[PDB]
């Protein structure tokens, strides 16, 4: 496929001003007789995605003329003069020339307030560290002279998870790679072990002024992971298949597993044949990481069924459709 590049990633401009977003593509988006297949859409939050501009610069019906697109070839631009209130939303660009017609990343647009723009807890937003490395996120404030700070992990569209609070108090379930420290007017949160799932927003919470009944959050910090690839060799898996043990057949369950040992790329489609027929809700999987000894992955596809349903059929199949592999290397089972 061929994708787009949407930048700048986010803008916070004053009302009445002008703003501009640029959308860059891999290859061209032009046909004959001077056409440009690219559209601009706004998703004002909650409301459905709204169409503003289509086919390069053509303005849609009902859209105000302050919206206007430009650009050609592979780089386009969209300008909105006299930005007002409900222009808030994530603006996207969509190509219509190359199938499958894909989207962009989106530009979350915000209105600058210029009123009380003094976050009591200072917190720099851009932080990035390499994989399996250490990084420390700091928080500053006048109230930190006599108060601690709590730390929270915020993944978009989910509940924020409390990570650390107080002197040395860490909740259960929360991994122990998170550690909280403080000194002077500063409070820190250090993630010693770098994992990919730690990529999210991070907020520090404490008081505002020394001696105040209120609490205040920081500006937020978007942590970014910098994972590498090691060796990207399209490598075939090694497929086995195991039957449910007889010790498991003296209970009420019976699971069938399928193994894929040390492969690449990550993509692999496993289709179960309960009896030369697919499954509709009884199969789960699990995968390890790059073993750092061969930099390849793994797979463990489990097919859990009740014992009254296991001894029903006689030929299960684990189908492995890969990229390095060409044919469905299938593994079946019997009982003798």
């Amino acid at each position: 496929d061929f994708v787009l590049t949407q930048s700048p990633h986010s803008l916070s401009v004053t009302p009445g001003e002008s703003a501009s977003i640029s959308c860059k593509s891999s290859h061209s988006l032009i046909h004959g007789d001077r056409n440009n297949y690219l559209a601009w859409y706004v998703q004002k939050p909650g409301r459905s995605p709204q169409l503003l501009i289509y086919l390069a610069s053509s303005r849609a019906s009902g859209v105000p003329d302050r919206f206007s697109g430009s650009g050609s070839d592979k780089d386009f631009t969209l300008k909105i003069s006299r930005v007002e209130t409900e222009d808030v939303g994530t603006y996207y660009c969509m190509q219509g020339r190359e199938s499958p017609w894909t989207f962009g990343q989106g530009t979350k647009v915000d209105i600058k307030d210029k009123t009380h723009t003094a976050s009591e807890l200072t917190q720099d937003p851009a932080v990035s560290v390499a994989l399996k490395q250490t990084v420390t996120i700091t928080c500053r404030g006048d109230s930190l002279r006599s108060h601690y700070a709590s730390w929270y992990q915020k993944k978009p569209g989910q509940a924020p998870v409390l990570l650390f609070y107080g002197k040395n108090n860490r909740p259960s379930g929360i991994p122990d790679r998170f550690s909280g420290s403080a000194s002077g007017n500063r409070a820190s949160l250090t993630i010693t072990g770098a994992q990919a799932e730690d990529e999210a927003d991070y907020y520090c919470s404490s008081r505002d002024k020394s001696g105040s009944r209120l609490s205040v959050f920081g500006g937020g910090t978007k942590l970014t992971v910098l994972d590498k690839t090691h060796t990207r060799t399209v490598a075939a898996p090694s497929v086995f298949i195991f039957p449910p043990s007889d010790e498991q057949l003296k209970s009420g369950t019976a699971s069938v597993v399928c193994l894929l040992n040390n492969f690449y790329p990550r993509e692999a489609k496993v289709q179960w044949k309960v009896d030369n027929a697919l499954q509709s809700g009884n199969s789960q999987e699990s995968v390890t990481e790059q073993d750092s000894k061969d930099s390849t992955y793994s797979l463990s596809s489990t097919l859990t069924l009740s014992k009254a349903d296991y001894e029903k059929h006689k030929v299960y199949a684990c189908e492995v459709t890969h990229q390095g592999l060409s044919s469905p290397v299938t593994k079946s089972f019997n009982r003798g």
């Binding site: 808030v88 219509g96 017609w101 894909t102 989207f103 709590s150 915020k154 978009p156 937020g220 597993v257």
Partner: protein, 341 residues
């Protein structure tokens, strides 16, 4: 055990009013402090208010950009929390979470107001304040919000009244939070092309029953990564023949309302560790000796609630004990594998 959910969130005109409801269960709500926290879209969290406990006097403290306008109250009988938003502005638009507030105060040194921290959080309701009517362009209606157990089959409907629009090509687009928009598939109004993206080509099915002007979207094999809102959009195109017609997308004009679907994640042989109550368990091979190609697999939460992870290792064909130890449940499980028939 702690369940926090918010409701009452919708759309209110600027200057109107809306009551938010946060139902709690799983702890002692009578003596627990509660805090409201909001987050505008694409921005940062902001402390809104907090209500104290019984002996603490039920006193409430608000933020400056909220004081006097909003109002927080609690009802310890229904175990619910309310935030009454009056004289609402275009600045109060964003997610609204409720959280069980913690009272941290170091004992031996001893200070005056200490700190407040938030232990458990709710999934968050959304409040939108931007006037409009949202119903003047409802030429495309979809199905109600569905909730499915992980792995079921859900069918999303998309219908125009009677026989409204057709010359536009049907498209399906998913809206993932933070990830942005993502094209899924389409059916040409001529009916000769029904293209689905190679990514969604596994579980998704696109159908168009033209006898009643209704579009379908079948979603089997539901995973926790598909929790998103599904929109159907009909748009124009430009077609010109070659050797086999070729189509070029013009735009996506008429959009649907958006069906929100949520899957409830809350409401060489080897060994297997199945049905153990707390995560996690460690597996060392041959009393900590075998490490060549040891592939211990991570754990997953199965339908029973307990975890179940695999642990295998590649063995040569000439040589033809997994020391598992689950301490947070008092179970020493050393075992050895052997085939039999």
């Amino acid at each position: 055990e702690v369940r926090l959910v918010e409701s009452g969130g919708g759309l209110v005109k600027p200057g109107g009013s809306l009551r938010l409801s946060c139902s709690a269960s799983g702890f002692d709500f009578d003596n627990a402090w509660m805090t409201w926290v909001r987050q505008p879209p694409g921005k940062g969290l902001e402390w809104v208010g907090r209500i104290t406990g019984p002996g603490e006097g039920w006193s409430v403290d608000y933020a400056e950009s909220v004081k006097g306008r909003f109002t927080i109250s609690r009802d310890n009988t229904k175990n619910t929390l309310y935030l009454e938003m009056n004289n609402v502005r275009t600045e109060d638009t964003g997610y609204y979470f409720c959280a069980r507030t913690g009272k941290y105060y170091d004992f031996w040194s001893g200070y005056p107001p200490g700190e407040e921290y938030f232990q458990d959080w709710g999934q968050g309701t959304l409040v939108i304040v931007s006037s409009d009517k949202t119903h003047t362009q409802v030429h495309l209606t979809q199905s109600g919000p569905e909730v499915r157990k992980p792995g079921t089959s859900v069918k999303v409907s998309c219908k125009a009244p009677g026989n409204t629009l057709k010359t536009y090509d049907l498209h399906w687009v998913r809206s993932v939070p933070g990830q942005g928009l993502q094209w899924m598939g389409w059916i040409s109004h001529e009916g000769d092309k029904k293209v689905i993206v190679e990514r969604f080509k596994a579980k998704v099915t696109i159908d168009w029953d033209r006898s009643t002007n209704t579009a379908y979207l079948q979603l089997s094999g539901l995973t926790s990564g598909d929790t998103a809102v599904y929109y159907c959009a009909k748009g124009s195109k430009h077609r010109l023949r070659d050797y086999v017609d070729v189509d070029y997308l013009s735009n996506l004009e008429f959009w649907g309302q958006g069906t929100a679907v949520t899957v409830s994640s809350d409401k060489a042989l080897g060994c297997l560790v199945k049905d153990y109550f707390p995560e996690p368990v460690t597996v060392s091979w041959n009393s900590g000796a075998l490490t060549s190609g040891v592939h211990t697999f991570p754990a997953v939460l199965q339908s029973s609630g307990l975890y179940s992870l695999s642990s295998v290792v590649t063995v040569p064909s000439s040589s033809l004990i997994c020391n598992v130890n689950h301490k947070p449940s008092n179970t020493k499980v050393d075992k050895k594998v052997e085939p039999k028939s």
